[PDB]
Amino acid sequence: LAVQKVVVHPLVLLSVVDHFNRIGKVGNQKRVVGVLLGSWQKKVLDVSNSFAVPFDEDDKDDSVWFLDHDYLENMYGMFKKVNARERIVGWYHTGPKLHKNDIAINELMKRYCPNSVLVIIDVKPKDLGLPTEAYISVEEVHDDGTPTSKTFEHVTSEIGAEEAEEVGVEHLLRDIKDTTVGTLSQRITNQVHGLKGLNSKLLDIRSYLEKVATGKLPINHQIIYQLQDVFNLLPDVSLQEFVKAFYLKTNDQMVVVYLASLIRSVVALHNLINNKIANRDAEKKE
Amino acid sequence: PAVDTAEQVYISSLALLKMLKHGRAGVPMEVMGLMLGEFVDDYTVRVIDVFAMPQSGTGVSVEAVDPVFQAKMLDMLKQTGRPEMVVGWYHSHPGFGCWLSGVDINTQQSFEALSERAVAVVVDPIQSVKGKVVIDAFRLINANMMVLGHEPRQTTSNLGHLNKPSIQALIHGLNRHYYSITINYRKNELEQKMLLNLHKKSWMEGLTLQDYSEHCKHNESVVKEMLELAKNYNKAVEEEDKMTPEQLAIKNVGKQDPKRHLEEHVDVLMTSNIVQCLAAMLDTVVFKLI
Amino acid sequence: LIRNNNTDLMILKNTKDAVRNSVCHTATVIANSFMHCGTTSDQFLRDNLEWLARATNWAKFTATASLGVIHKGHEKEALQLMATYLPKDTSPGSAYQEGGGLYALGLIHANHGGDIIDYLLNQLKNASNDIVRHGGSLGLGLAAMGTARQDVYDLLKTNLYQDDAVTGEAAGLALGLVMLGSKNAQAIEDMVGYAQETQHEKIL
Amino acid sequence: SRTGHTHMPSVVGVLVFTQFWFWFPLSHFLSLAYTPTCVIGLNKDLKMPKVQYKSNCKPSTFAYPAPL
Ligand SMILES: [Zn+2]
């Protein structure tokens, strides 16, 4: 598509959290909506700033909602005066999931940026996923004969920081972040987190299938198509060729691990030699 | 009613990130902006947020505050739940430390005329490194009071003398024309958790296996490197056998250390191969056809 | 203490001549109080009144309070003694002196304010300036240490709930002092809940 | 205390004196920790007689410092 990856800077996250908190101080709200400013680098979005805009909606009806687009334009001008290279690239809202009226809001935003990106930023501290979920509006051409509609195609979202922004984040995360853990422990923790995320995704798919089976949701006929491919992609690890290749590869890596460990042991013995010699010299001169 | 040295300026995480980004973007201009917050009491100056003022034109210095832009930004921010008064101004010092020049003193005099407890914050985005940002808060010392023989502020605690002033700031008029207010940071659990997502790798790449062709090529290359490294390591051991203690480090200058490179290669290969093996073993269980 | 008051004023004079900052000034005041604690001897303050006048703002609050350290245990007469030291009413910068006088009165009768609790409670109730309330809270807590008197607790809790930093610090400290070791659920709940609600760091 | 009991005024005074870091006047609380070092002789009338105890040690071992 027109968007390959959306990089959301920590300043955007902090601004969104602050906007949500200051609006929610009123004690009666569900979500807040603002505008996202960034630059364009190849096909990778670089969402780097944001500003709040007045917004309200009805709890029952989805067609009733007000967004101050004049406020949008005025603050776009004010921000453009400060930073001309940051242009409107989309919008954000803090609702935990999508809304039925999100397509209308994206249509409103598309005038200012034709390829607008909606970045749902969950203020609640989710334990596994990233707080950002990026979507772009696409015209879904169905093959069932149903008329073409506008949907939100998901986009891989990442959190990246500028050099000074990273410096500030590390200053704010100085105490909390533990960097003493070695690289190997970090990779193993990454594997654990990947297992947890895969379990969560599979549980979401299972819950959707459970709802479909009991009739809570209709058969999409497109999620089923994707799920058949997913189950077909499950490799057979019991094949003789695969097992032999896996064993050969594991032995090829284990011989390297053995060589590295042997060299490490010899170097450790050399260190012990140096320590003992230094201790004996220190006690001999004293 | 002398100001107390125990006064503190509380900068929020959003405010700090905004000033750091604006100062780095405006290098080497002394880009300025306004700090919205609240004077909680005589000892606290909370800085809830900041907003950057646009630069009129070229020049590495603080320009005059545009009243129209400030009024428009304040009025519009009040429309979206930001009814916080201006508690002072911030401006960037790209690499020459945190202090106030004559132009900065004249600019801060305006805020002090408006609000007597306004604070001039200086952030050094160039000298700031990860985990330690170079920042300071200042307020002018009135010449009339100090000349007659009065301390600029009263010391009722140790809180105002915990940070030793830098010599660069002292040269540029610190404790003579302006005084430094201790800066503390307000961090909540929510914002810290939100910032923790920075560089947080996706769950997909946790189970993602590296290409086995490139992995084998890397293993072979590093092992071939350790071959020469051990060949040199033997010579290094023999040389250090007969080498005087003054040359233990001087003779290591400019010459590669086979032991250090051997350790680095061992660590790299151990990590890479162990991670790849563990990931493959996990994938053989998770993604199975049965 | 007064009979065996073998204090050395030479050291105090030697270090007073080296004073060049307000911090060292109040340090010398506190030191003079320390070496004359319980001796009712204010000679150093008497021969250096013009130097003692250099104290300003909270330093005055300290200096006056130093009296209570020097006259600690002088239970025979203290209200009259403090009134002799301090005039009843003064306009310029007298809030610090009045608060220091109340704090010094509490210091004189520390842990033994048998009949001075009533006077301190009346002064704290009939106080308008925040410095005066701070000093009165410190004195009342100092004079009701461990007594757990309900009237003192209620007045101090009201002063704490006034949400003034200067008043709140002394109010919280005296709230802890008055209910010293009582482990009462009400006191713990009030103080902790306020500490989780107040926005002034001095109160905390 | 001399009998081994926890002197509550001493502990409280020391703790609040340590709070001179945040508030200089609180240093005066150290006066609470000041316990006089004395041996008071009394009579049946709770009065003070002219009694001269004997210290079986050199006078310079426990004496005031010599004034400058
Ligand atoms: Zn400057």
DSSP string, C9-33: HHHHHHHHTT--SHHHHHHHHHHHH
H-run or E-run covering C51: helix C49-52
Cα distances (Å, whole numbers) of residue B227 to A137, A251, B259: 56, 20, 12
Tokens of C49: 């009144």
Nearest by Cα to A123 from C26, D2, B189, B62: B189
Using CA atoms, how far apart are residues C96 and A229, in angstroms rounded to an integer?
81
Q: Do the Cβ atoms of B139 and B119 come closer than 8 Å? A: yes
Strand B178-186 with B132-140, pairing: antiparallel
Strands of A5-8's sheet in order across: A149-155, A132-140, A117-121, A87-93, A33-41, A44-52, A5-8, A157-159
Q: Is D23 on the interface with B (CB under 8 A)?
A: yes
How close are the terminal C-alpha atoms of chain A, in Å? 75
Which residue does chain B place closest to D19, by CA atoms?
B157
Which residues of B are part of a known binding site for Zn(2+)? 91, 93, 104
Neighboring chain D residues of C8 at a CB cutoff of 8 Å = 65, 67-68
**Residues in Cβ contact with B16 at an 8 Å cutoff, skipping those fewer than 6 apart:** A168, A171, A172, B133, B135, B185
B contact test, residue of D17, D18, D22, D26 with most B CBs within 10 A: D22
Instruction: Please classify residue B162 by burial: count the beta carbons closer than 10 Å to its beta carbon, then call 0-12 exposed, 13-18 middle and 19+ buried.
Output: exposed
What are the chain B neighbours of C56 within 8 Å (beta carbons)? Answer: 2, 154
Strand partners, B154: B4
Chain length of chain C: 204
Angle subtended at Cα B183 by Cα B138 and Cα B193, rounded to the nearest 5 degrees? 145
CA of B91 to the centre of ligand 1 (A): 7
Write down the H helix ranges in chain A: 10-24, 69-82, 102-110, 163-172, 183-213, 223-233, 240-285
Of residues C174, C97, C178, C170, the one with CA closest to residue C134: C170
Cβ distance of C110 and D32 shorter than 8 Å: yes
Asked if B10 and B186 count as a contact pair (C-beta separation under 8 A), the reply is yes
Q: Is A186 left (phi over 0), alpha (psi -120 to 50) or beta?
A: alpha
Whole-angstrom Cα distance, residue A62 to residue A196?
A: 35
Give B101→chain A minimum CA distance, Å: 23
CA A65 – CA A55 distance, rounded (Å): 7
Tokens of D5: 């009991």
Taken in order B157, B159, B160, B165, the sign of the CA dihedral is positive
Q: Exposed, middle or buried, A257 (CB in 10 Å: 0-12/13-18/19+)?
A: middle
- What the block records as the tokens of C108 is 């004189």
- Assess whether the previous peptide bond of B28 is cis (omega < 30° from 0): yes
The type of residue at C30 is: I
Rg (CA), chain A: 27
How far apart are alpha carbons C152 and C158 in whole angstroms?
10
CB-based contacts of D65, cutoff 8 Å, min separation 6:
C8
CA angle C26, C32, C33 (to 5 degrees): 90
> What is the spatial distance between Cα A102 and Cα A91, in angstroms, rounded to a whole number?
10
* DSSP string across A8-60: E-HHHHHHHHHHHHHHHTTS--S--EEEEEEEEETTEEEEEEEEE--EEE-SS
Per-residue HEC secondary structure of chain B comes to CCCECCCEEEEEHHHHHHHHHHHHHCCCCCCEEEEEEECCCCCEEEEEEEEECCCCCCCCCCCCCCHHHHHHHHHHHHHHCCCCEEEEEEEECCCCCCCCCHHHHHHHHHHHHHCCCCEEEEEEEEEEECCEEEEEEEEECCHHHHHCCCCCCECCCCHHHCCCCCHHHHHCCECCCEEEEEEEEECCHHHHHHHHCCCCCCHHHHHCCCCHHHHHHHHHHHHHHHHHHHHHHHHHHHHHHCCCCCHHHHCCCCCCCHHHHHHHHHHHHHHHHHHHHHHHHHHHHHCCCC
Orientation of helix C165-178 relative to helix C130-143, angle to 10°: 10
Q: Nearest CA to A12 among C12, B18, C168, C80?
A: B18
Hunting for tokens 């590669």 — which residue is that? Answer: B256
**Ligand 1: centre distance to CA B56 (Å):** 16
The helix (H) or strand (E) run that includes residue A135 is strand A132-140
Residue pair C130/C162 in contact by the 8 Å Cβ criterion:
no
Identify all chain C residues contacting D32, using CB atoms and an 8 Å cutoff. Answer: 110-111
How far CA A89 is from CA of B87, D8, D37, in Å, comes to 32, 67, 79
Distance CA C203, CA B225 (A): 64
Q: Is the dihedral of CA D46, D50, D54, D59 positive or negative?
A: positive
